[PDB]
Amino acid sequence: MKRLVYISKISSLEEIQRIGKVSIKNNQRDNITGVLLYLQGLFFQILEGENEKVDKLYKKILVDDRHTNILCLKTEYDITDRMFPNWAMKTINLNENSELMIQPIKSLLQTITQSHRVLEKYMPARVIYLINQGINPLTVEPQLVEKIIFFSDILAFSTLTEKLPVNEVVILVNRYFSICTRIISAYGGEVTKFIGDCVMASFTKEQGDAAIRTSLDIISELKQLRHHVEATNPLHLLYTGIGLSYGHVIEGNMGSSLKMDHTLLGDAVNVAARLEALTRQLPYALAFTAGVKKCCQAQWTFINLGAHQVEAIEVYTVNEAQKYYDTLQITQLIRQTLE
Amino acid sequence: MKRLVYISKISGSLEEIQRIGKVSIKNNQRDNITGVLLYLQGLFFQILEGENEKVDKLYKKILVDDRHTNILCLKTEYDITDRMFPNWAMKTINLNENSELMIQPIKSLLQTITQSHRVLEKYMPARVIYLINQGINPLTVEPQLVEKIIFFSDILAFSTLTEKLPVNEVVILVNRYFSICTRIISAYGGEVTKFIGDCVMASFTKEQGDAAIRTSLDIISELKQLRHHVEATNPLHLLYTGIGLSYGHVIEGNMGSSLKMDHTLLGDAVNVAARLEALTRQLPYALAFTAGVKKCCQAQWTFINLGAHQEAIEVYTVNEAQKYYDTLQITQLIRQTLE
Ligand SMILES: Cc1cc2nc3c(=O)[nH]c(=O)nc-3n(C[C@H](O)[C@H](O)[C@H](O)COP(=O)(O)O)c2cc1C
Ligand SMILES: Cc1cc2nc3c(=O)[nH]c(=O)nc-3n(C[C@H](O)[C@H](O)[C@H](O)COP(=O)(O)O)c2cc1C
Ligand SMILES: [Cl-]
Ligand SMILES: [Cl-]
């Protein structure tokens, strides 16, 4: 038996009662007990029952359109007892509870949960996934894994920061991060960090083609954006270069009780970064290693760009990543445009 | 009138908890402070309301109390119209001793969300924790151009250490290095912003020039003590660092999309500090910084000019940062030891 807890965000009061009625019916049939609280636009649900049976329900609740931003906070895998043996699904509306002695607990709960939701927006997606799976991020051991590492950043970003107002730079950076995160995630990748204007992400060794396609789609969407906007919009000057590496990296949660983070340790991270920087002096906006190339099964036109020093290593690209522009001219054009 | 909420962990008894309750009633009666103290599973929740001078005066007293630790103020309300608890000088509730069944769901939800909250706090940038502690929602703060000293430190010959050490040995070594850097940076008023691979990124204000140099020297010194504290079979015996400091304008604030948010620092100084840390590999000093950092220093260091490096930039260090070893020889030692 196992018991899990999740919180969610509500997307009218009668419909909630309908939910509760359905749950009472469905859960008694499956020996599932639990509770549904709601307060100030948030849902709280505890569910317990047979391991297989709770999972089917949770999948239904996940795809349910009535709530969004679902996060499973805790899972307990071999519970000796149930917490609510008699409740198929007790609905408790903490909004219309006016009892004074419950008001401090209720107020603290709302404050702490809202604060928790704010913090969730800064978490690495890999930690959120771990928590959703019932794994303690603080105790899980890091592992060596084979990964494709993705690095991209904004062309001539120092020139742009030098010549643009604060809000313009932030709007531009936010648009860039938005387009990178959306495309990376669409292809199954995971964004690791933003470092300045750099986007760091990782794909699995089975996602070589997806990484190439992510890189091409980001470049392609930037080119569209550049001719979507007027020439007074800074977005008209947004270009990117992309580096990809493949290797062994130690993935996990690192640090101390004072400060934690999710990190990838290994040479491939630095190689991807150097390759991304190398695209400035290349006729292509995407550079990757032989290891990345070997993870690809599609019929790309790989182009060998010789050995370069980051030891020297072979550097490849695909034909479709070729620049329709000259890079040095572009940075000068950016400089002159901002005069 | 001011109302604030905070949570804390108990350091290190029912009669002692009730003694806290009685002292608070007396003092709060004196200063027209009302509120609620709540205890649950080694955790403290307290709500305090009153006029500004008195609640701050009490809060400073509460921070220094040795009975609780890891104090975080979650919300602050200013010039409030009403009191939330007009009639309670200090109502102490021990939810551990509450056996009521109807309260058990809310009590369980509070414990779970608070414990998850404390875990999430560890992953936050120190600037976000700071903003929350000031009763400011970090998500509503607008980015600002500010003058910052940027700090970068990483592990020497880390590529060799990852290649030749087991995963668990690498993790113990990186955790200890992160543990040491975070403690010292934080002790000196610096803010750790994130870990990138084996690198620690932090920022200091322009008024903390000496504190940043002292932070760097202290980390180096503590690594030196540790290297001779341990046996030669311990990976910690081979742990060295290089440190880079830069000074310049950076944009600070929340950036990204609905898919991924983060606290980022945008600016030329971020890249410069990273390159200077890497530059220490080929210098007889473990610390390298720009001229702007040197101008932020009021203490009488022996600054040493290491010329210009790559537009070129001028590099400085302090005589105190000199290595008692040759760096190439130390790298060869690291590889020869691991055979
Ligand atoms: C917040 C929330 C909690 C829910 N909890 C339960 C639950 O505990 N048990 C249950 O059977 N259904 C629950 N539901 C939704 C129903 O599973 C779903 O609407 C219905 O069962 C679909 O019926 P079907 O299986 O015939 O498609 C919940 C929905 C929401 C939005
Ligand atoms: C969790 C916790 C909550 C506390 N709350 C209050 C409080 O609300 N009011 C108060 O005067 N002291 C509170 N105290 C303790 C104060 O520091 C107290 O005034 C101190 O222990 C004794 O003060 P005194 O030396 O001036 O007599 C609290 C302590 C703890 C650990
Ligand atoms: Cl693929
Ligand atoms: Cl990382």
What is the distance in A from the centroid of ligand 1 to the CA of B113?
23
Q: Count contacts between A and B (CB, < 8 Å).
A: 227
- DSSP, collapsed to helix, strand or coil, labels residue A262 as strand
Resolution, in Å, please? 2.2
Task: Please name the residues between 231 and 290 in chain B that touch chain A, using a CB distance below 8 Å.
Answer: 251, 253, 255-257, 259-268, 270-271
CA gap A169, A175 in Å, rounded: 10
Strand duo B34-40 + A302-309: pairing? unpaired
Bridge partners of residue B4, in order along the sequence: B48, B76
CA gap B80, B99 in Å, rounded: 34
Note whether A272 and A263 are within 8 A (CB). no
Q: What is the DSSP letter of B140?
A: G
In degrees, to the nearest 5, what angle opens at C-alpha A229 toward C-alphas A223 and A231?
A: 100
B11 CB-near residues (< 8 Å, 6+ apart) = B66, B67, B68, B69
Nearest Cα residue to B105 out of A103, A115, A46: A46
Q: What is the DSSP letter of A238?
A: -
The dihedrals phi and psi of B268, each to the nearest 5 degrees, come to -65, -30
Among A46, A144, A257, whose Cβ lies nearest the Cβ of B105? A46
Atom in ligand 2 nearest the alpha carbon of residue B90: 8
User: Considering only alpha carbons, which residue of chain B is nearest residue A277?
Assistant: B271
Q: What is the DSSP letter of A321?
A: G
CA gap B136, B114 in Å, rounded: 19
Note whether A150 and A203 are within 8 A (CB). yes
Which residues of B fall within a CB distance of 8 Å from A196? Answer: 264-267, 270-271
For A218-230, b where at least 16 C-beta lie within 10 A, e where not — what string? bbebbbebeeeee
Cα B313 versus chain centre, distance: 30
Task: Please name the residues between 298 and 317 in chain B that touch chain A, using a CB distance below 8 Å.
Answer: none
State the method: X-ray
Number of helices followed by number of strands (H, E) in chain A: 10, 13
Which residues of A fall within a CB distance of 8 Å from B134? Answer: none
Note whether B80 and B4 are within 8 A (CB). no
Rg (C-alpha) for chain A, rounded Å, is: 25
Distance from CA of A210 to the nearest CA of B (A): 19
Note whether B26 and B92 are within 8 A (CB). no
For A42-57, b where at least 16 C-beta lie within 10 A, e where not — what string? bbbbbbbbeeebbeeb
Nearest Cα residue to B118 out of B185, B70, B68, B75: B70
| Count of C-beta atoms within a 10 Å radius of residue A122 | 19
Which residues of B fall within a CB distance of 8 Å from A47? Answer: none
C-alpha distances in angstroms, A113 versus A102, A142, A252, B337?
Answer: 16, 29, 26, 51
Strand duo A33-39 + A90-93: pairing? parallel
C-alpha distances in angstroms, A229 versus A12, A223, A233, A237, A316?
Answer: 41, 11, 6, 10, 32
Q: Which two tokens stand for residue B5?
A: 């909420």
| Count of C-beta atoms within a 10 Å radius of residue A304 | 11
Query: Which amino acid is present at A262?
Result: H
Note whether A117 and A10 are within 8 A (CB). no
Q: What is the DSSP letter of A301?
A: -
Query: Which amino acid is present at B25?
Result: I
Sole residue written with tokens 């948010």: B261
Cα B178 versus chain centre, distance: 11
- Cβ of B67 below 6 Å from ligand 2: yes
Among A111, A124, A195, whose Cβ lies nearest the Cβ of B75? A111
Number of helices followed by number of strands (H, E) in chain B: 10, 13
CA gap A253, A239 in Å, rounded: 33
CA gap A301, A320 in Å, rounded: 8
Burial of A259: CB neighbours in 10 Å, binned 0-12, 13-18, 19+: buried
CA gap A96, A79 in Å, rounded: 32
B12 CB-near residues (< 8 Å, 6+ apart) = B67
Sole residue written with tokens 């020869």: B336
CA gap B40, B113 in Å, rounded: 12
Nearest Cα residue to A192 out of B121, B195, B129, B178: B195
CA gap A190, A177 in Å, rounded: 13
User: Considering only alpha carbons, which residue of chain B is nearest residue A262?
Assistant: B195
Backbone break loci in chain A, preceding residues, C–N > 2.5 A: 11, 310
Task: Please name the residues between 149 and 208 in chain A that touch chain B, using a CB distance below 8 Å.
Answer: 158, 161-162, 166-167, 169-170, 173-174, 177-178, 181-182, 185, 191, 193-197, 200
Query: Which amino acid is present at A122?
Result: Y
Ligand 2 test: best mutation among B27, B32, B49, B94, most atoms within 8 Å of CB? Answer: B27
CA gap A202, A270 in Å, rounded: 13
C-alpha distances in angstroms, A96 versus A149, B84, B105, B211, B280?
Answer: 51, 17, 16, 53, 63
Bridge partners of residue A148, in order along the sequence: A203, A246
Note whether A149 and A204 are within 8 A (CB). no
Strand duo A260-265 + A190-195: pairing? unpaired
Domain ranges of chain A: 1-140, 141-339
The residue ranges of DSSP E strands in chain A, in sequence order, are 2-10, 33-39, 42-49, 67-76, 90-93, 143-154, 190-195, 198-204, 240-255, 260-265, 286-288, 302-309, 312-318
Q: What is the DSSP letter of A284?
A: B
Note whether A217 and A183 are within 8 A (CB). yes
Task: Please name the residues between 122 and 141 in chain B that touch chain A, using a CB distance below 8 Å.
Answer: 122-126, 128, 132, 137-139
CA gap A203, A201 in Å, rounded: 7
Q: What is the DSSP letter of A40?
A: T
What is the distance in A from the centroid of ligand 1 to the CA of A86?
19
Rg (C-alpha) for chain B, rounded Å, is: 24
- DSSP, collapsed to helix, strand or coil, labels residue B147 as strand
Q: H or E segment at B9?
A: strand B2-10
Q: What is the DSSP letter of A52?
A: H
- DSSP, collapsed to helix, strand or coil, labels residue B247 as strand
DSSP string computed for B13-78: -HHHHHHHHHHHHHHHHHTT-EEEEEEETTEEEEEEEE-HHHHHHHHHHHHH-TTEEEEEEEEEE-
Q: Which two tokens stand for residue A313?
A: 């290593």
